[PDB]
Ligand binder design. Structure first.
Ligand SMILES: Nc1ncnc2c1ncn2[C@@H]1O[C@H](COP(=O)(O)OP(=O)(O)O)[C@@H](O)[C@H]1O
Ligand SMILES: Nc1ncnc2c1ncn2[C@@H]1O[C@H](COP(=O)(O)OP(=O)(O)O)[C@@H](O)[C@H]1O
Lengths: 62, 371, 38, 128, 374
């Protein structure tokens, strides 16, 4: 009995599994396979450049 | 651990997610549906209006309308409904506890930013909210600080060049040629095959057809000759009612309106010519980098063969000594949100947030002071 | 307009199913009840 | 034939059972109500269907309820005199402008359960 | 409120059913006929009975002429309808009409005067505190228990198809066909002539109806069954008349209900019931059709023929595209389904808001029924 093992209405964040489009099913898996947001933050050389660029663009204007 | 929220809005798609996450938590169309048929069944579930993913399920009994067209909102109440559904039903988080990050088109009227800020502080009691440019965030998601970016959504197409983290306001080019107009053109050219689609649900069906069975031709006349002289370029779509249609010749005809707007009769030039003109408006010294870094963004640029045709059309107008290359990330649909998820995560960005208390003495114009 | 004129709005669909199931269950138990007294 | 058998099962079990329970309860209650008023004179009925056939007790009950003098019953023990005795009470009810529908003397004499119960119910609705 | 239960009255052309709310089965089921004597009355002292109505009108049908107050779902004679309602309320249920509200059913596409006169009769004479009028095919979906589906209701007076998706009914896709078991009884009475049997009086029509209800079925293939009936005598069956005579129906058994699928046997230009259901499906929008294909619901006493569901499924499958899955839902209790739905509708706590009060009728006349109900 898999059907007794779990219930669709017990967990809403398991209920999200049923109502997915197939291309939406790939987009999440591929995008957390890539981990781009983790890559940008973990890599320093681009990171402090972005840091200081935002800070000193605030410094003179906007 | 209070974390910021990134909410990306575009005409036809709303995404939302916590800052610092790889994936947005919620993705759903920006649709509002109201019942059209006489509802007679006492005691069962009826509602005044359906919104989001639930509204798309019941397309048969609903009239579906979009609150945003061409990047400009038409009815603010529907926008409030979508924002409330995003904050409460999708993420189940209080809007007044976490800061929220918002995006918009670069060129837009004055009143949009002010009304958006007023609604976001007054209705939801957001402690801090910031407005950012979509295409700039897409370039940050690509991870280069320089280059010219092309973001083409379902509302409007725009190319902006960014050099050293600054987007030049004079060189920004905007063209009102989007995917919804392509859907209308595809419906008009499917009329002549014998299949007729008129209602809004049939427009969504035509949009799904366009997403599944469209591609960009490398040579337009040669592909017309091949499609006229043979039946190889024919695919069959299977309708939700069981009917089967043959898309046939039209597959490369609908996206080609992106390059030649004379099919739609628009006065403006093609998208590649728009990108070339935007590059021409910049200074000479940076033009090399503008020809060296070009990324594609938006769901409209997911047609197969868009990169090769774009590169060829840019190389045709470019000088012979210039080197042309086109960068197309596979996740170009959700690049903008990813950039937002970068921008809220920085340690220098906490001072960039708009203060709730400062808005009290400033007012709705405060964003024009700070952004 | 007025598409929802004949019905009230914001009603739980579960209650109708529960009462239908109750009427269904009355057959299985086949309890015999007299009519309401005048 | 299987679903036909199931439908015959349904309309043999439930439709019969509910109606029989309701008519048994109504029969007991109507018997008590008639016995309460018929006890002023020395008269008592054990079965509602059987003792009301001859038409004498209906005349006695209507005489007790109404308060005036109905014509005395036809002196007989046949079926025709029985029909006459029931028809006298029905005509006296036709005086009081009480509305009776599908009611005849032969229906009471033969002993149809539903029509006798309806006659008693109509009398109760009038004379209470 | 709790002990008081509104009466539920299903009122078709053929038979009338009545009971209390919250009950699984109706208390009183009886035919809707009003009979009157025609011969001499010579025995003095038997009493005078002007009209016979209901089941005991059927028992003495030998000396009576029988009239139907409802023809094609329309109340042609209203006095006989008052007789039927009075016999239902007093003799059958033994309830005072002032005590409980009344729920009524009717056909989808009917003249407005029928509804107005129903409201006027149930307020002015029986003096009811509240009353509601509903559609039979909507109540069939309540009895089925599903939110979406297409209901094909075929009674004694009229056949009609309504589609409902997510509790929303489409008025433009509702279809009405004047082809029911009444015309099938007339057709059987016509085709029984060629075997030598003649039925002409109104009393013999009930015998023909009984013959139809006992010895009829729907062939899955018409031409093959006709060839089988011509080749052999295994299809023949015997019926016994009330006077002891024996008749043999033989070939006619699958020819009487076949007029439902081919109306050209009756001279009608209309389409069959399967084509009517298919056309009602394709009159709806594109998206819901799949769901309307999966929840076809049969109802009414006319759909009690053996083998009706298999033939209907085969015809719909032949008409529909092959990639869709076609199933026909026919409960064994589909004769009473409408009434059950009424009880389910009558016992809801929400529906207590939707009753038509007597004060509203007093303010608005008999025109209040169109603004409420459906
Ligand atoms: N897989 C796909 N292939 C081709 N076109 C697509 C695909 N997915 C979406 N589109 C097109 O892109 C549009 C959605 O663009 P989107 O990225 O949502 O714009 P925005 O987010 O700026 O509103 C749709 O109208 C559709 O026509
Ligand atoms: N067991 C049966 N088999 C076949 N046909 C039947 C059966 N019972 C009834 N019918 C047909 O249905 C008709 C009665 O239908 P009914 O359910 O009374 O309709 P309504 O209640 O809507 O008036 C009869 O005239 C007869 O033609």
């Amino acid at each position: 009995e898999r059907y007794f093992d779990r219930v669709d209405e017990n967990n809403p964040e398991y209920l999200r599994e049923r109502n997915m489009a197939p291309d939406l099913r790939q987009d999440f898996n591929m995008m957390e396979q890539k981990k781009r947001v983790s890559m940008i933050l973990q890599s320093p050389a681009f990171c402090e450049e972005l840091e200081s660029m935002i800070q000193e663009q605030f410094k003179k204007g906007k | 651990d209070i974390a910021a929220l990134v909410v990306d809005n575009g005409s036809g798609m709303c995404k939302a997610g916590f800052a610092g996450d790889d994936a947005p938590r919620a993705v759903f169309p920006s649709i509002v549906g109201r019942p059209r048929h006489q509802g007679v069944m006492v005691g069962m579930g009826q509602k005044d209006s359906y919104v989001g993913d639930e509204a798309q399920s019941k397309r048969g009994i609903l009239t579906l309308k979009y609150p945003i067209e061409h990047g400009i909102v038409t009815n603010w109440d529907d926008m409030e409904k979508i924002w409330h559904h995003t904050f409460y039903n999708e993420l189940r988080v209080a809007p007044e506890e976490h800061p929220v990050l918002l995006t918009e088109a670069p060129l837009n009227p004055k009143a949009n930013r002010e009304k958006m800020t007023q609604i976001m502080f007054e209705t939801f009691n957001t402690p801090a909210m910031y407005v950012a440019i979509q295409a700039v965030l897409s370039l940050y998601a690509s991870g280069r600080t320089t280059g010219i970016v092309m973001d083409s959504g379902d509302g409007v197409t725009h190319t902006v060049p960014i050099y050293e983290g600054y987007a030049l306001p004079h060189a920004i080019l905007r063209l009102d040629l989007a995917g919804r107009d392509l859907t209308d053109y595809l419906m008009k050219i499917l009329t002549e095959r014998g299949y007729s689609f008129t209602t809004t649900a049939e427009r969504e069906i035509v949009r799904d057809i366009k997403e599944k069975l469209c591609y960009v031709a490398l040579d337009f006349e040669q592909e017309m000759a091949t499609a006229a002289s043979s039946s190889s370029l024919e695919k069959s779509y299977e309708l939700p009612d069981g009917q089967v249609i043959t898309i046939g010749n039209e597959r490369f005809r609908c996206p080609e309106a992106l390059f030649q707007p004379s099919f739609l009769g628009m006065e403006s030039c093609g998208i590649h010519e728009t990108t070339f003109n935007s590059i021409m408006k910049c200074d000479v010294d940076i033009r090399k980098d503008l020809y060296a870094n070009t990324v594609l963004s938006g769901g409209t640029t997911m047609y197969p063969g868009i990169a090769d045709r774009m590169q060829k059309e840019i190389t045709a107008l470019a000088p012979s000594t210039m080197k042309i290359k086109i960068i197309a990330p596979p996740e170009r649909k959700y690049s903008v949100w990813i950039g937002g998820s970068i921008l809220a995560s920085l340690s220098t960005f906490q001072q960039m947030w708009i203060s709730k208390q400062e808005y009290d003495e400033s007012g709705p114009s405060i964003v024009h002071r700070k952004c | 307009a007025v598409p929802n004129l004949f019905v009230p709005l914001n009603t739980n669909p579960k209650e109708v199913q529960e009462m239908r199931n109750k009427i269904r269950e009355q057959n299985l138990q086949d309890i015999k009840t007299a009519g309401p007294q005048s | 034939d299987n679903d036909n058998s199931s439908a015959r099962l349904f309309e043999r079990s439930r439709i019969k059972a509910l109606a029989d329970e309701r008519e048994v309860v109504q029969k007991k209650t109507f018997t008590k109500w008639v016995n309460s008023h018929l006890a002023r004179v020395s008269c008592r009925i054990t079965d509602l269907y059987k003792d009301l056939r001859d038409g004498r007790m209906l005349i006695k009950l209507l005489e007790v309820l109404s308060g005036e003098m109905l014509p005395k019953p036809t002196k007989g023990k046949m079926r025709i005199h029985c029909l006459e005795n029931v028809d006298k009470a029905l005509q006296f009810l036709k005086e009081q402008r009480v509305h009776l529908e599908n009611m005849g003397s032969h229906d009471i004499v033969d002993g149809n359960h539903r029509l006798v119960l309806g006659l008693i119910w109509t009398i109760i609705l009038r004379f209470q």
